[PDB]
Design an enzyme around this catalytic site. Structure first.
Site, PDB file in Angstrom:
ATOM      1  N   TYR A   1      21.248  -5.958   0.778  1.00 12.17           N
ATOM      2  CA  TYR A   1      20.499  -7.018  -0.073  1.00 12.17           C
ATOM      3  C   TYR A   1      20.663  -8.336   0.457  1.00 12.17           C
ATOM      4  CZ  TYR A   1      19.559 -10.512  -3.889  1.00 12.17           C
ATOM      5  OH  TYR A   1      19.524 -11.328  -4.716  1.00 12.17           O
ATOM      6  N   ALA A   2      19.507  -8.996   0.368  1.00  8.04           N
ATOM      7  CA  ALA A   2      19.365 -10.625   1.237  1.00  8.04           C
ATOM      8  C   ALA A   2      19.043 -11.419   0.167  1.00  8.04           C
ATOM      9  CB  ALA A   2      18.367 -10.278   2.603  1.00  8.04           C
TER      10      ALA A   2
ATOM     11  N   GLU B   1       8.189 -12.539   7.775  1.00  6.67           N
ATOM     12  CA  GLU B   1       8.393 -11.530   6.716  1.00  6.67           C
ATOM     13  C   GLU B   1       9.528 -10.974   7.067  1.00  6.67           C
ATOM     14  OE1 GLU B   1       4.198 -10.817   7.588  1.00  6.67           O
ATOM     15  OE2 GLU B   1       5.379 -12.646   8.573  1.00  6.67           O
ATOM     16  N   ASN B   2      10.029 -10.749   8.155  1.00  8.49           N
ATOM     17  CA  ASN B   2      10.976  -9.604   8.420  1.00  8.49           C
ATOM     18  C   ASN B   2      12.304 -10.281   8.887  1.00  8.49           C
ATOM     19  OD1 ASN B   2       9.146  -7.634   8.209  1.00  8.49           O
ATOM     20  ND2 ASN B   2       8.772  -7.447  10.107  1.00  8.49           N
TER      21      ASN B   2
ATOM     22  N   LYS C   1      14.061   0.269  -0.392  1.00  3.06           N
ATOM     23  CA  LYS C   1      12.854   0.312   0.154  1.00  3.06           C
ATOM     24  C   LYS C   1      12.319   1.710  -0.058  1.00  3.06           C
ATOM     25  CE  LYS C   1      10.504  -0.484   4.403  1.00  3.06           C
ATOM     26  NZ  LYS C   1      10.639  -1.231   5.923  1.00  3.06           N
TER      27      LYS C   1
ATOM     28  N   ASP D   1       8.833  -6.297  16.100  1.00  3.80           N
ATOM     29  CA  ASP D   1       8.071  -6.865  15.056  1.00  3.80           C
ATOM     30  C   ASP D   1       8.587  -7.909  14.419  1.00  3.80           C
ATOM     31  OD1 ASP D   1       5.844  -6.904  13.185  1.00  3.80           O
ATOM     32  OD2 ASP D   1       6.833  -5.332  11.850  1.00  3.80           O
TER      33      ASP D   1
ATOM     34  N   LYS E   1       0.745  -1.349  -0.100  1.00  8.91           N
ATOM     35  CA  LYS E   1      -0.141   0.052   0.161  1.00  8.91           C
ATOM     36  C   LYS E   1       0.838   1.473   0.031  1.00  8.91           C
TER      37      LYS E   1
END
Ligand code: COA
Ligand code: MG
Ligand code: MG
Ligand code: MG
Ligand code: MG
Length: 265
Positions: free
Chosen positions: A86-87, A134-135, A36, A130, A17
């Site tokens: 970058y991962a 996802e993180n 990002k 958090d 979003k």
């Protein structure tokens, strides 16, 4: 000092979003990294703007192999740009959907890297709040890196800001708006250890309301294949009273952890 002009933008790494993450390469050096890119518009028309300040101010000053680095940032009056390490191997999220569950050696290793990373963050009194698949990003040798510091603050803290997503990983003190501290990340760790071995968070429900109840009651059960040592480590981390949760040293030195893990402390 940096601007978009310096980068070639490659394939998207995430969409949502508020904007997108992109694979990117710096033009003069060919340094490959991630960008990002958040839309100012949506951050303001949402009330997240102050979190981007803390994400940059906190992450940029952390240096640890199990913490995703933030190299810098810039903006351009439509958007904000976070310059990220970058991962290459993706998220534990993707790894989990792929294999459905993880074995005890792989689980215990991910936990060790996590606790080492949180140890260093808790040293600087930084709490992530958090921690979730996802993180968790995977470095080029498959090692786990914590990323996405949007929710990180210095402890102790209250929560004025709104808990928009799933509750699966948050502790009782946090879903209820109480004062919270470093022990928040320890609850999350036990949620993750459980999800890694079982395949779903220990409080998953169909509604936010049911999920909230199960978290408030600390109401989870083990499928029979979960062993006694994991059961023990998970049960010790998922305690309603934050003070009863262990220290990270007791986690890194838990017998089940040291047996099955491969990485050191
Ligand atoms: S809670 C209210 C619901 N909506 C929202 O608030 C979410 C809106 N956010 C957006 O639209 C933003 O554009 C994004 C970037 C989606 C914000 O999400 P995050 O704050 O969670 O940003 P992340 O750092 O966590 O990036 C999300 C996904 O992109 C990949 N990714 C990020 N950074 C990297 C690096 N360095 N290397 C590789 N991949 C990277 C991750 O895959 C991450 O998780 P996914 O598995 O793709 O979902
Ligand atoms: Mg660079
Ligand atoms: Mg995220
Ligand atoms: Mg965020
Ligand atoms: Mg799931």
């Amino acid at each position: 000092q940096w601007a978009l002009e310096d980068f070639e933008i490659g394939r998207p790494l995430g969409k949502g979003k508020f904007g997108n993450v992109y694979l990117a390469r710096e033009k003069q050096s060919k340094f490959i990294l991630a960008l990002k890119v958040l839309f100012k518009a949506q951050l303001e028309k949402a009330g997240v703007e102050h979190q981007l300040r803390r994400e940059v101010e906190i992450q940029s000053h952390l240096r640890h192999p199990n913490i995703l680095r933030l190299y810098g940032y810039f903006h351009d009056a439509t958007r904000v740009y976070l310059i990220l390490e970058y991962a290459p191997l993706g998220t534990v999220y993707r790894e989990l959907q792929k294999l459905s569950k993880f074995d005890e050696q792989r689980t215990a290793t991910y936990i060790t890297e996590l606790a080492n990373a949180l140890s260093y963050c808790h040293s600087k009194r930084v709490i992530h709040r958090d921690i979730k698949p996802e993180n968790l990003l995977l470095g080029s040798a498959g090692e786990l890196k914590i990323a996405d510091f949007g929710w990180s603050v210095h402890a102790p803290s209250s929560r004025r800001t709104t808990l928009c997503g799933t509750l699966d990983y948050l502790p009782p003190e946090m879903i209820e708006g109480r004062m919270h501290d470093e022990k928040v990340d320890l609850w999350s760790l036990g949620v993750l250890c459980y999800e890694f071995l079982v395949g779903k968070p220990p409080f998953e429900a169909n509604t936010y309301q049911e999920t909230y109840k199960r978290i408030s009651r600390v109401e989870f059960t083990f499928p029979d294949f979960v062993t006694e040592g994991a059961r023990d480590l998970i049960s010790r981390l998922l305690k309603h009273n934050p003070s009863q949760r262990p220290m990270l040293r007791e986690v890194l030195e838990h017998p089940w952890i040291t047996a099955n893990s491969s990485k050191p402390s």
